[PDB]
From Swiss-Prot, chains A, B:
Glycans are attached at residue 7. The gene is S. The chain holds residues 1128 to 1150 of 1273 of the full protein. It comes from the Viruses. Subunit of the fusion protein that is processed upon entry into the host cell. Mediates fusion of the virion and cellular membranes by functioning as a class I viral fusion protein. Contains a viral fusion peptide that is unmasked after S2 cleavage. This cleavage can occur at the cell membrane by host TMPRSS2 or during endocytosis by host CSTL. In either case, this triggers an extensive and irreversible conformational change that leads to fusion of the viral envelope with the cellular cytoplasmic membrane, releasing viral genomic RNA into the host cell cytoplasm. This is Spike protein S2'.
Amino acid sequence: VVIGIVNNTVYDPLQPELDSFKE
Amino acid sequence: VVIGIVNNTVYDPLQPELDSFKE
Ligand SMILES: *[C@@H]1O[C@H](CO)[C@@H](O[C@@H]2O[C@H](CO)[C@@H](O)[C@H](O)[C@H]2NC(C)=O)[C@H](O)[C@H]1NC(C)=O
Ligand SMILES: *[C@@H]1O[C@H](CO)[C@@H](O[C@@H]2O[C@H](CO)[C@@H](O)[C@H](O)[C@H]2NC(C)=O)[C@H](O)[C@H]1NC(C)=O
């Protein structure tokens, strides 16, 4: 819908912190 | 770098809630 959007990635602080420990 | 800084602790709401359950 937005003119000029770009691809990138957004960091998720929760996922590594709570997947390394929960493993 | 800051003049007047003090020592203290900052509560982490995530750590107890998600380490007691993940144990
Ligand atoms: C990155 O951006 C490109 C375009 O800027 C996206 O490419 C489109 O992707 C859809 C779905 O895969 C296709 O139907 C279009 O034909 C693609 N267009 C072009 C110009 O390539 C792409 O989806 C974005 N994301 C990624 C991960 O590549
Ligand atoms: C609490 O504050 C004191 C100073 O206000 C800090 O003490 C310094 O600690 C560093 C690293 O351990 C030393 O190199 C300095 O010599 C210490 N200075 C003094 C005046 O003690 C201390 O790091 C802070 N944190 C804790 C947990 O004590």
